[PDB]
Amino acid sequence: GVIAAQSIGEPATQMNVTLGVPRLKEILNVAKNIK
Amino acid sequence: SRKESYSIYVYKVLKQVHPDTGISSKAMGIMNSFVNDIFERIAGEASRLAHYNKRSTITSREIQTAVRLLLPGELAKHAVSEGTKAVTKYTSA
Amino acid sequence: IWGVKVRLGKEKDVVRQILKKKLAREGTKNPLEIYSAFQRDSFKGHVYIEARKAEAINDALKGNVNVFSNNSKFLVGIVEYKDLLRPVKLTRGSYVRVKNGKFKGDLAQVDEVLENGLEARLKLVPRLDYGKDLSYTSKFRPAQRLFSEAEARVHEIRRDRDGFVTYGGEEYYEGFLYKTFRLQNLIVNSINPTLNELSLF
DNA sequence: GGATTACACCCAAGACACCAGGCACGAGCCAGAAAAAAACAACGAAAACGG
RNA sequence: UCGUUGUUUUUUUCUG
DNA sequence: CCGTTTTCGTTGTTTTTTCTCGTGCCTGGTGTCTTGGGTGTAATCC
């Protein structure tokens, strides 16, 4: 579990649809109405 | 004490017919007596008409026919028209 | 009576303001319609005035900076009215404590209450260094001991009676300090004896 | 057609969904370093001074 | 004569 | 000397009025159903 957590989080640190940190944040919180 | 009358209601009716017309207290009492006696007459007529047909409740038609019986032709017809219009307005709305 | 909150500590000032404005407006066309007002020590921050209409109370408090501006007023019950005006054990030979000066915190026995009733004599335990540091305060007082004529004569004076010695205006009788004490400096109630008192007294 | 059994139906009453505002929270990286600053108003004693 | 203890609280400017 | 007074300690203690993002949670008047009795109607008898 921890290994997956770190392996997924770390790449994000190194970075018309919206992609990148905002998209990941939307996904994680399960935003009901994405941008 | 709480001896209810028809003072303010007669005042309002008077204001809508002759808005700038006053009245004395004894005229108000005369109006109260007239209205009460007419109310008693119409209610008694409705009660007797219900008794004649052996119906234990009162609808508006009993009051309509009582007003027809009590008042003469033209006045009874005008009362019928006003009552019908008021009842229909109270029904639809 | 209505109790309107007033500024902390300035309640007697508010009482004085009420009284003096009542005096000054008397006979005018806008007098203060009040009968009697009071403040009690227990009811600190509470101002009570006798009247019949809240307008009189508002007038009395209006124009005072010594009052909380809020009209945080309330009524008083019939039985409760006397409570607000209800105001509410000192005997020689019983043990009392000191709370003032350099001997504060020492149990003592009353010797004699003045005829007027303003100063109460006590039987304290002397705290004497026998002239080691004469050249005090309530934070440098050394240990306590009964006065000893022999030690007092050896280390450091007048004898008026057998066992009585007058030292620096202080009275030492049977090794116990006698002195005039103000009644405000002492309390006769709310005393729990201490271990040293049990050992000695 | 009055009497008589038959019923049409509807409307006020009452139960419930829900409701969009408002209303609050309540969070918002890691480790490390240094210098620089930190309550006080009034009170009654008690030494103080000239009377 | 072994033993032998040294503040908090904030704010600040910094380092990766 | 001694009564007036600042004074060193003590003792006690509040109030003139003066920017971010989101989910979650918490309210009403509304809205729609449906209930029940009573009025409306007519089918039948004689």
Swiss-Prot record, chain B:
Glycans are attached at residue 81. The modification N6,N6,N6-trimethyllysine is found at residue 54. GO terms for molecular function: DNA binding; lipopolysaccharide binding; protein heterodimerization activity; structural constituent of chromatin. GO terms for biological process: antibacterial humoral response; antimicrobial humoral immune response mediated by antimicrobial peptide; chromatin organization; defense response to Gram-negative bacterium; defense response to Gram-positive bacterium; innate immune response in mucosa; killing of cells of another organism; negative regulation of tumor necrosis factor-mediated signaling pathway. The modification N6-malonyllysine is found at residue 85. Disulfide bonds: none annotated. The modification N6-succinyllysine is found at residues 3, 85, 89. The modification Omega-N-methylarginine is found at residues 55, 61. The keyword Zinc does not apply. Keywords: Acetylation, ADP-ribosylation, Antibiotic, Antimicrobial, Chromosome, DNA-binding, Glycoprotein, Hydroxylation, Isopeptide bond, Methylation, Nucleosome core, Nucleus, Phosphoprotein, Ubl conjugation. The modification Dimethylated arginine is found at residue 48. It is found in: Nucleus; Chromosome. The modification N6-crotonyllysine is found at residue 3. The modification PolyADP-ribosyl glutamic acid is found at residue 4. Monoubiquitination at Lys-3 (H2BK34Ub) by the MSL1/MSL2 dimer is required for histone H3 'Lys-4' (H3K4me) and 'Lys-79' (H3K79me) methylation and transcription activation at specific gene loci, such as HOXA9 and MEIS1 loci. Similarly, monoubiquitination at Lys-89 (H2BK120Ub) by the RNF20/40 complex gives a specific tag for epigenetic transcriptional activation and is also prerequisite for histone H3 'Lys-4' and 'Lys-79' methylation. It also functions cooperatively with the FACT dimer to stimulate elongation by RNA polymerase II. The modification Phosphoserine is found at residue 5. The modification N6-(2-hydroxyisobutyryl)lysine is found at residues 3, 12, 15, 26, 54, 77, 85, 89. The modification N6-(beta-hydroxybutyryl)lysine is found at residues 3, 54, 85, 89. The modification N6-glutaryllysine is found at residues 3, 12, 15, 77, 85, 89. The modification N6,N6-dimethyllysine is found at residue 26. Belongs to the histone H2B family. Core component of nucleosome. Nucleosomes wrap and compact DNA into chromatin, limiting DNA accessibility to the cellular machineries which require DNA as a template. Histones thereby play a central role in transcription regulation, DNA repair, DNA replication and chromosomal stability. DNA accessibility is regulated via a complex set of post-translational modifications of histones, also called histone code, and nucleosome remodeling. This is Histone H2B type 1-J. The gene is H2BC11.
